[PDB]
C-alpha cells in the first residue's frame, strides 16, 4: 500500500485510469535531491491520512515522457489528477501547503 511507483512511461496512464475517479497525487522525484528526500516521509504519511485518495511517485527519469508531457521543472513537484485529468500542481517541500492543497480537492 502507500505511495505506489510507476515504474516507467507506460505505466502511467494504466495507474491514471486504475484511480477511477477518486483524487490523485502523482509526486514527481529525482535521486540526489534534498526537498525530494525531505517531504518523502511527509507524502507516505498523507497516503496513510487519506486512504480514501491514490498516491504514485514517479521519477523523472525513470519516466521521461511523463515529465516532460507534464512539463516537469523541478523535483518536488506534486500534480492532481481525477479522471485522469491534471487539475493542480505544487512545488516543493513544505508539507503544510501540500496537505492544505489535497484537503481543498477532497473536498
Same mark, same amino acid.
Given at each position: 500500500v502507500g505511495v505506489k511507483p510507476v515504474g516507467s512511461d507506460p505505466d502511467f496512464q494504466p495507474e491514471? %485510469? #486504475?484511480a #477511477? %475517479?477518486?483524487l +490523485? $497525487? $502523482?509526486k514527481f522525484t529525482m535521486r540526489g535531491c534534498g526537498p525530494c528526500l525531505r517531504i518523502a516521509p511527509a507524502f507516505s504519511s498523507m497516503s496513510?491520512?487519506?486512504?480514501? +485518495? $491514490?498516491?504514485?511517485? $514517479?521519477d523523472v527519469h525513470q519516466c521521461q515522457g511523463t515529465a516532460a508531457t507534464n512539463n516537469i521543472s523541478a523535483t518536488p513537484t506534486f500534480?492532481?489528477?481525477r479522471n485522469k485529468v491534471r487539475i493542480d500542481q505544487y512545488? #516543493? +517541500?513544505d508539507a503544510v501547503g501540500l496537505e492544505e492543497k489535497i484537503k481543498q480537492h477532497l473536498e
Open positions: 491514471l %485510469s #486504475g #477511477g %475517479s477518486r +490523485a $497525487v $502523482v496513510n491520512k487519506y486512504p480514501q +485518495a $491514490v498516491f504514485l511517485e $514517479v500534480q492532481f489528477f512545488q #516543493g +517541500a
